[PDB]
Swiss-Prot record:
DNA binds at residues 50, 54, 57, 68. This is Glucocorticoid modulatory element-binding protein 1. It comes from the Eukaryota. The chain holds residues 90 to 179 of 573 of the full protein. It is found in: Nucleus; Cytoplasm. Trans-acting factor that binds to glucocorticoid modulatory elements (GME) present in the TAT (tyrosine aminotransferase) promoter and increases sensitivity to low concentrations of glucocorticoids. Also binds to the transferrin receptor promoter. Essential auxiliary factor for the replication of parvoviruses. Residues 1-77 form the SAND domain. It comes from Homo sapiens. Homodimer, and heterodimer of GMEB1 and GMEB2. GMEB1 and GMEB2 form the parvovirus initiator complex (PIF). Interacts with the glucocorticoid receptor (NR3C1) and NCOA2/TIF2. May interact with HSP27 and CREB-binding protein (CBP). Zn(2+) binds at residues 24, 81, 85, 89.
Length: 90
């Protein structure tokens, strides 16, 4: 079908989050398309220059809002988070 996704940013860098690939705990999961390469949020954040924050969920933004908040709202949280979790996402 279609690849559900969301446009995201980090610093002045733009990328695309493939939502169904966004699986807990997300940090090292290849779910971000950046320059036609599928990479992890940790790598995207590093390349965007925000690794010094030590909080990828706050470094990445969706519509200007910290990804952390969109995740906490339940509207854009990890795919199938209620059943698939590492217990280290918090
Ligand atoms: Zn989790």
């Amino acid at each position: 079908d279609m690849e559900i996704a969301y446009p995201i940013t980090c610093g002045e860098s733009k990328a695309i989050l493939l939502w169904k690939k966004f699986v807990c705990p997300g940090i090292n999961v290849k779910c971000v398309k950046f320059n036609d390469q599928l990479i992890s949020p940790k790598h995207f954040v590093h390349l965007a220059g925000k690794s010094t924050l030590k909080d990828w969920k706050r470094a990445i933004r969706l519509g200007g809002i910290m990804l952390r908040k969109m995740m906490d709202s339940g509207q854009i949280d990890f795919y199938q988070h209620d059943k698939v979790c590492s217990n280290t996402c918090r």
